[PDB]
Amino acid sequence: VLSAADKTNVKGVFSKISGHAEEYGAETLERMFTAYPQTKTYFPHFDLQHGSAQIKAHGKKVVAALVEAVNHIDDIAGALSKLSDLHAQKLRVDPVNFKFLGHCFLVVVAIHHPSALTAEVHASLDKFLCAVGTVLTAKYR
Amino acid sequence: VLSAADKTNVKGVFSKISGHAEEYGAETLERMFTAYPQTKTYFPHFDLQHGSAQIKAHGKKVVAALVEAVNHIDDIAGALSKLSDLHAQKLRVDPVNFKFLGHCFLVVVAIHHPSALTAEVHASLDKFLCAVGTVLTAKYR
Amino acid sequence: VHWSAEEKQLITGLWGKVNVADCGAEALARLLIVYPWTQRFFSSFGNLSSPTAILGNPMVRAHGKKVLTSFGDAVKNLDNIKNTFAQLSELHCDKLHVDPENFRLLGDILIIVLAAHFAKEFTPDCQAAWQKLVRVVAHALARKYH
Amino acid sequence: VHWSAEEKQLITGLWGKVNVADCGAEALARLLIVYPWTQRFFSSFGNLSSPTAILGNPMVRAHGKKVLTSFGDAVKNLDNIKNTFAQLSELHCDKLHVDPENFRLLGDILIIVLAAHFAKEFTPDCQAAWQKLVRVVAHALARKYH
């Protein structure tokens, strides 16, 4: 349910990552395809080799979507309604996959901005990822 | 996300069950304590014997809460905000338990009103149970 | 798992009355309507455009018959469950990449369906035994996930 | 599960640098702040009223030290994982009634914490090996759930 402090905590860590979208979204796709190989099944068409340029590019587009829901955090569904149709309806992604993606993202922010990631920002960032997950899977429920 | 047809489907089956709250909410608690005994852990104080009168009474109060969210289906969070504090904050129920409860409820409506329970009402009723689950666990996210 | 002799009685009594064709067809069709992302794995089944089209697609019916028949092999060999599903584990795990949590959504749908077909004969103790069976079957299929 | 010799190298290299006390305390404390219903099982720990109170409660620190020490016994015996956690399975399953999905939330928190302590040394291949370890540990603890 994002409280006022959650919203702020999220904004807070996104300022430190708003500057490196492409290196951060690529790294998160790479750990996702490496720790959870079953997610590679959704990108049959991409080159999935470390540093492929399709990973960098998609990486960059995955975190701008994030930044954009940070920005409209008050109505994440409304700001992301075209992505919800793509993933639920067109792509049909299984919901479990969003938790794999969300976790590889926390893992990038702890490796790179540890101190930003306290236990309470940790909790705000998780409810956020989870809100995005739910909106992107919403034409399922 | 409850669509217009979901809302109706839910109203539709709740009319057939709005008349037997107590026999239906008791039966669902009884199958829950029987198929998932780990849920008995939350009612240390109740007599949990088939037909105990505390089960009947609580059963009756569990389905009136349901009926009441059916009735304010447009804002289930708002109509159920005191129940969300009781379960999340006071009682601390683990979210998995709500899926045990929701499932033993589907199981009572199929045993008793099979034909009402088509595959599409089945899908509406599930998104509903899930919306209630999420609201009752909401002071967790 | 240990099976009591009465659990075995509640699983076998019930199983003999099951219409495998109709129960399997109904359960697969509800898996695909209630949890729509599962439709991704049955892209080869053709039209799954609507619940009404899903309900009468002949490959969904046929395939449903076949998944419930597998439940039967479990019912028959309650003690060799591992060997029974060992080849199935590799197909679902290794080949299809289905996450084990959909294995659970499907057995839960089976319980709802057998409940709608058996009404009051599906007692809470009967419910319980069948819940354990789908749980052990879901577990034998997730096993090549090592 | 099969462990490659390089997985074993990535688990052992890393483990030797771990501060068990601090990593265990941090991981238990984050489990309780991030997933608040888990606080129900540690009602005996006293004050878990705030993240700040949770962070400095001495029983959370002590207990954290002890859960990470169990991870170590796994690290040491990667092939006898079953026997190692067999008594723990009964305590968590039989006595505490913890659902196995919180076993997964806790290993995921461990990975986040070791990532924050190791930074770039925690490579995606290192991530992967550790993900498998927490998954096998989560699985050995859910086993008396039969």
Ligand code: HEM
């Ligand atoms: C936080 C969760 C996610 C966000 C914000 C997100 C973001 C995006 C964006 C922005 C696009 C459109 C890209 C474009 O227009 O070029 C996209 C597409 C896509 N997403 Fe997601 N995604 C997420 C999770 C997932 C997950 C978990 C999967 C599957 C494992 C997935 C699979 C796909 C695929 C296969 C595409 C199409 C890519 C292409 O066609 O090149 N997404 N996603």
Ligand code: HEM
């Ligand atoms: C659809 C989900 C649920 C609904 C609508 C619901 C409904 C209710 C209601 C209406 C009350 C307050 C009763 C009163 O004021 O006397 C209550 C309390 C309670 N609930 Fe829930 N409940 C649900 C799920 C759960 C689950 C899954 C659990 C745990 C397994 C749970 C555990 C409790 C307990 C232990 C109490 C206190 C009962 C007492 O103190 O006598 N509830 N619930």
Ligand code: HEM
């Ligand atoms: C635990 C419950 C399950 C059982 C007993 C089961 C059983 C079976 C059986 C017997 C086959 C047929 C293999 C053959 O005839 O060669 C099969 C195939 C298959 N299953 Fe399952 N299954 C289960 C769960 C799932 C789930 C949840 C999904 C999808 C989410 C799934 C997707 C598939 C697909 C795509 C195929 C192959 C279809 C084809 O090749 O025509 N299975 N399963």
Ligand code: HEM
């Ligand atoms: C897979 C990860 C886990 C491991 C390795 C683990 C390990 C341990 C160990 C070594 C003990 C101490 C037993 C003793 O010293 O006698 C313990 C106790 C306990 N665990 Fe876990 N645990 C795990 C997950 C969980 C989870 C997720 C929860 C709660 C959600 C939990 C709740 C408890 C409680 C309440 C106790 C007893 C505390 C006490 O008696 O003081 N455990 N666990």
